[PDB]
C-alpha cells in the first residue's frame, strides 16, 4: 500500500513515495506538510464581532 | 490559493469616506486587522510566500541535545562510576527548554538518538590493543528496579527496553509514543504536590518519566577510558496548546522556574533621533 | 557590559568616509578624497580609549 | 615587522634575481622579481613579479 | 541477496532529517485526546497578536514600568518629536525583546508588512493630534516634521476612539529581509511628531502616556530557522 | 533602409547612416507585472516627464585615445526629473535606449566598440586599498581608460586591454553591443531592458550596468583634415517607475 | 530530430546568383549565420552529435572543493584551535570561482560533501589506542550565536542543522535549497554597501550565507591529532543568466575582483607563416 | 529484515555522480523566480557568438590594443601574405584566449565547423581585395598565393558591405578533434593573401586595420569535460 | 508513483527508474536530461530581422 | 528507514560478476557506429576457419 504525495517545490518528478514499515504510528516520519492555521482565536477573541471599518465604540 | 500561503494586497484608490479602518480600540482586547491597502494606496502584488517553516512540526522537529552522560571503565568516584543514570527531564539544557516553554500543553511523539564518544583517559602510557567497546542503554520505567552496581542482574533487560551499540556504526535511534497519563505534557503546573498545599511546588511533581541507565558491556580495559553519552530528543506529530509569553531571564534550576530579575530590553541613550 | 560608541565621524567635504565596521570601540574607518584633490591628514582612523571615554585617534582631512 | 612570508615558490622556469634570492625576511606588501633559467625565454604578456598578501602568502604564481 | 551500494551520506546523523525508527514500546496505547481550548498550529498565529513595545528605554528605565510609557505634554512649539526608532524588528533594542521580537529572533529572514497600534492613556478631556511616520532608508533620518511628512504618514486624531493603527508597509528591493541587520536589507525609521499640540482644560496634570503595540499583518512570513541569541548557558542545570 | 527615427517624450532623434537597433538580450523594456513585484506600495509612473533623450557631454576622440566608460543611472543623476525622482524615492526600475553618435567624413578612419556591460565590477589600481566613489563614476563626465596600466592609489584599473573588469577586452561582444565604423556606420543604438536579480533596487548604491566605448582601430586622417571629431552620447530612459516616496536623499 | 542534436549540412550546388550569404555587416552587432553549404559545395552528411555535455546542469554538476578547514585536539594557536570556522563563500578556490563568474546571475540548489581526514601530529612517541573520532559540523545562519570556545553550550544544535560522523564510513551529504533573499545569486554586484556611496565595494555586501563550525566530539586524545575537513559544493537544478566574458587574469583576493594586468594572449614571433 | 549485499563501489565519493541526499532545511520556501532577460541554457549558446581575435601578437603587442589590429597597406607586388595562423581553436596562441578559446579549453574534444568573420576598418574611399584560405593539413603551410588558391578560399571584395565570412568547414577523418593538439587530429592552417592591392585616393593615411572575429556554426559540439589550464593557484584566497 | 524515462545511449532495457524518496525538491537528483537551447538572444539580438542572403545594409 | 540485513558476500570483489556501477562521465555522447566489415560475434566463428598445421616439427 504505497502513498504518493506532492514534494515541496518553489512557485513561479514532483512526487515522492512513502511506505510505512513499522506496525505502530509513533514510528512514522515527521508530518512536515500540514500548513493549516486559524489565528482568529488570538486576534479576534471577542463575543460581539467588530467590523474593521465600523467604529469599535 | 494553496494552504499556508500568505494573502496578497488588493488594489486601492484615494478614498474620502466615513469608513475608518485605522481608528479602533485596544480596550476591547482586539488586535487590528488593518491591511496595508486600508491606510494608503497599494498596487496588486501576488504573494507566493509560504508559511512552511513556522508550523509546530517544522519548528520543533529538529533534534536538540538534552544531557551529557559521563561514565568510565574504572570507578574513581560516584560522578564517574562504572555506570551512570539520568532522571528523564528536558529542562537541563537551555535551548530546547525555551522552545517547550513557549506553549503550556504539548502532546508530541519522540525519537531519541545517542551520540556516544569514548576518549582515552590520561595515564603514564597508552599503548594497548582494545576491542571495540559496547554500550547498553536501559530505560527503567517509573517504579522499576534500578541497578545498584555494575555486574548486577538488574541489567538483564528482562522486560525493559534496551539498546546495544558497537562503536563505529551509525548512532542508535528509537521512537517513543505519547507517554503521559493525562492528555497533554504539562510544561507548567501551577500548584503543589500534596493536598494540604505543601510539598514541592511546580512541574517537578508531574515529571514522572523514569530513568535511563548507561553502562559499558565490555568488562575490562587495560588502560581506562571515559565515555560521554549525549542524548538527542526530537519531537514529532506535535500538538501545542495555550501559548505562553517567551521567557526573558535565563534559567537557574532544572526543576524550579527560579530566576533573577532584569530589565525588559536593552537601553539606549535618548528616546528620539537626530539627523537631517 | 557592551561596547562603547565613539562620536559620529560626520562628513568630509569633497571626500569619502568608509565606515565598514561601525563606530564602536576598536573599529577602524578610512578616508579618501575626490578626483583632483590632495589629502592633508591620515588616510585611516581608529577608535582607542583616552582615559574614560572613546575617541578617534586623529582628526579629519579637509580635503584640499 | 616580525610576521614574514616564507620563501617564494619553486618555479621550474623562473628563479629569483639578486638580492631577493639570499634573504629570508619578506614583510607584507614586498615584491620579488623573476629572471628565468638559461633554457627559457620571457613571455611578454605576463609580469614576472610576486607580492606578499596580508595573510603571509605569496600571490598566484603563473608560469612566466 | 539483493545487490545494493551505499551512497555518500550513510551512517551519519543529520540533525534536521526525518526517518522512520523502530519504536521502543510497541502496541502502546496512548491516552485519548481532549478538546483543550487555544490550539496553536503555527508560530505566525502568535506573531499576529499585539504587544506593548518599550520605547522609553532611556536610560536605566528598563528596570521599571517606565519603559513602556511614551510621555506627551503640552508643547510651546509644534512639530517636535515624540519618539523615534529604527525599524529592525529583530535587532533594534526597542523591538527585539517584544512578542514580535522573541519569535522573529528564532529565524533569519522575514517578509511582509507590520502594524503599530497606539493608545492614548491620558485624561478624557485632553485633546491632541499626532503624525506617525515611516520613512524608507534612502535619505537617512527625517530631521523635522517637514522632512517626515513627505514619506508615509498617518495623522492620528485623539477622540472617543482612543487608538490609531499605522500600518508600516512592505517596500523593499529584496523579497526577504534579514533579522540580524545587514546594510543591504535596511528597513527604515519610525518617527512620531506633534501635529498640533496637547490642549487640556484646567485641573489636569501635564505628563500623559501613550502605549505602542506592534503586530504583523496577514502577509508576514519567516524563514531559515536558527537558535536565539537570548538564552545562553555555561554548564548543565541540575 | 539605412534611416531610422526614435521619438521618446518630447524629443526625437534622426539618423541617416544607422546599422540596426540591438534590443538588449531580445527584450523590449516593460513595466513590472503584478506577479514579479515585491513592494506593496503604489508606484509613480511619469510617462513623458522622464522618458526622453537626455544628451550628455561630448568627449573628444584623440588619435592617442584609449576609451571611455559611463555608469548608469548614476551618470544620469543631474538631468531633468530623472535626477529628481531618483532623490525622492528608495526604489527604481527602468530600461534605457543608448544612442552613441560620431560623424567624421569619408576621409577619416577608425572603429569603435560600443558595449553595455551589466554590472561591470571594476578592480582596484593599487590593491588592499578601497578606491573612491568618484573615481569610478562622476555625475556627468564620463571616465577615461588609460593607455597603459594604472598606478593610482585610490582609483580603478584603467588598462583598456583588460577592460577594467579583468577580462579580455575582445570578449565583450556577448553583452549587447554595436560598432561605429567610420567607413560605413555613423551611430550605434542599443535598447537595454532592466537587468537585475531584484525587481526594483536603489538607484544610488548600485550601478545597474556600464556603457563602455573603446576605439579598436584608432582615429587616423590626413594632417589637413578636421583634427577634432567629437563623440556624443544621447541616452533615454524607458518604462521608468519608482517606489517608496520619502524625503530627498541621498545620504 | 531529437533535442540537443546539432544540425546537419544540406546539399549544395555551384551557384551564380545575386544572393550574398558571405557579405554582412558586423556594425549591426549581428553574428553571421553562414552554413558551410553557403560558401562552398557540401554533401548531405547527417550529424548525430548531441550537445549533452554543454548544458548548465552537465557543466556545473560536478563537485568541486571550496575550503580546507584545519582543526586539532589540543590548541596550539588560534589558527589550529580546538574548533574552527568558515564564513561561507565560494570565492576562495580558483577552479569553481571561475565557473561561477561566467554568468552574472545564477540560481542553483546545492549539495555538500565533507571529506574529513585526520592525521597524527608529530611528537616523541605515537603508540596509543584511539577510539574512532567523531566530528560535528554545525551551520550557523547569519545572525546566530557563534561558539566562542569548545565545551560551550552553543554546540547543543538546538535549532541549527548539524551532522555527525564517525570515522571510516561514507562521507556525509546534505542538500541545500536556493538560500538567497533576492531572486538569483548575484555573482557580481557593481555597487557600494551604504547609501552615501561608501562602505565596501562589490559582492562582499551581498554574500550573507552564514558560517560553518567544525569540531571534534571526542574530548581527549593521548597524543594530539590534526584533522583536515574539505568541503565539496556541487550545484544542481541550476539556472544561469547574463553570461560574462571569462576571466583572463588570475585572482588575488577572496572578496575583491582585484587583479594585476597582463597581455591578452601568448606572443609569437611573426604575424605570417613561412614554408613551401 | 530484507537480505541485501553490497556491490563494489559502496561508501565511495565519486566526484561526478548524482544521488538524492537528505535536505538540511526541510519545507524551505525558496524565493519566487522572475523573468530575468538573457538566460543561458547551454554553453554552446555563448560559443556561437563572435569575438575579435588577437592575430597581431608579434611581439610584445599583447600589452596594448595593437594585438587585435591586423595591418594592411598599399603594396608594391600582389600576392603577399596578410596574416597566418594554425587552426587550433583551443591551443594556438591566436585562438586559445578568445571567447571560443576559454569555453573550448574547458573540454577535451570538439566537432563541427567554424566561422571567421572579417571587418575592414579603413577609410571609406579606400579599396581592396583579399583571398582568405583554409588549407587541410596534408602538404604543410601554403607558401604563396598560387599554393593557397588550390584549397578552400573566399575572395573578399571591400565595398559598402564591410564584412566577409569565411566559413572554415569540417574536413576530418575522425568524428572529433582534440582541444590540446595531438598530431593525429591536426586541423589545418588559415592564411590571407593580397588578392589585388589596396588602392587609395590622395590625402588618406597608409596603415589600415582589419578586425577578425571567430565563431562556431550550428553544428559545433564539445565533449569530455576537464579543468582549464588558465586559472592556477598555490594557496587558498583569504 | 514510479517514473520510467529514457537512458542516454548512442545513435547508430533502454529505460531507468526514479523514485523520489524525500519530501522536498532540493533533495532530488540532478536534472541531466534538459537539452533545450535558444541562441537567438545572443546571435540575433536585433530589432529589424536580417535575412542571411539579403545585404545587411 | 527500510530494515535490511547483509548476506554473506557483501563488500567483496568477485572477479567475474556483473553489476551496475555509476558512470564517471554522465550524459556523454559516444561517437556513432559505422558498418565496419568483418564483425566477430562469437569466438567459435574463428575456430571454424582452416589453418595449416605444422606436422613436420622434427627436429629443429
Ligand atoms: C531504549 C531507551 C528508550 C528511552 C525511552 C525514554 C522515553 C521517555 C521520554 C519522555 C518524553 C517526554 C519528556 C518530558 C517532557 C515534559 O512533558 C516537559 N519537558 C516538562 O518538563
Ligand atoms: C549541516 C551543514 C549544512 C551547511 C549549509 C550551508 C548552505 C549555505 C551555502 C550557500 C549556497 C550559496 C553559496 C554562495 C554563492 C554565491 O552566490 C556566489 N558564489 C557569490 O560569491
Ligand atoms: C515493507 C515492504 C518491503 C518490500 C520492499 C519494498 C516494496 C514495497 C512497495 C511495493 C509493494 C507494496 C505495494 C503497495 O502496497
Ligand atoms: C520510498 C519507497 C520505498 C519502498 C520500496 C521501494 C519500492 C517503491 C516502488 C514500488 C511502490 C510504488 C509504486 C509507484 O508509486
Author numbering:
A (entry chain D), I (entry chain D): 2 to 13, 24 to 68
B (entry chain A), G (entry chain A): 9 to 284
C (entry chain E): 126 to 189
D (entry chain E): 62 to 125
E (entry chain C), H (entry chain C): 1 to 238
F (entry chain B): 11 to 261
J (entry chain C): 1 to 60
From the article:
We also determined the atomic structures of E30 in complex with its receptor FcRn and CD55. We determined the cryo-EM structures of E30 F-particle in complex with FcRn and CD55 under neutral conditions at 3.3 Å and 3.6 Å, respectively and obtained atomic models for these two complexes. Bindings of FcRn and CD55 have minimal impact on the capsid structure with RMSDs of 0.3 Å and 0.4 Å, respectively between mature and complexed viruses. However, in FcRn-bound viruses, the pocket factor was released and the pocket partially collapsed with the side chains of Tyr147, Asn215, and Met217 repositioning to decrease the pocket volume, similar to the pocket observed in E-particle, whilst there is no notable reduction in the amount of the pocket factor in CD55-bound viruses, indicative of that FcRn is capable of triggering viral pocket factor dislodgement, but CD55 might only facilitate viral attachment at neutral pH. Compared to FcRn, the interactions between E30 and CD55 are reduced by nearly half, where the short consensus repeat (SCR) 3 of CD55 contacts both VP1 GH and VP2 EF loops in E30 via hydrophilic interactions. In addition, CD55 presents a distinct attachment pattern to E30 in that the binding site lies outside the canyon, extending to the “south”. This site is roughly similar to those observed for SCARB2 binding to EV71 and for integrin binding to foot and mouth disease virus.
The genus Enterovirus within the Picornaviridae, a family of non-enveloped viruses with a positive single-stranded RNA genome, is comprised of more than 100 serotypes. Human enteroviruses (EV) are presently classified into four groups, Enterovirus A-D (EV-A, B, C, and D), among which EV-B, the largest group, consists of over 60 serotypes, including all 6 serotypes of coxsackievirus B (CVB1-6), coxsackievirus A9 (CVA9), over 30 serotypes of echoviruses and more than 20 newly identified enteroviruses. The capsid proteins (VP1, VP2, and VP3) adopt the classical eight-stranded anti-parallel β-barrel configuration with the N-termini residing inside and the C-termini exposed on the surface. Most of the uncoating receptors bind to the “canyon” sites of the viral particle, dislodging the “pocket factor” in VP1 and subsequently triggering conformational changes of the intact particle to release the genome, albeit that SCARB2 binds EV71 outside the canyon.
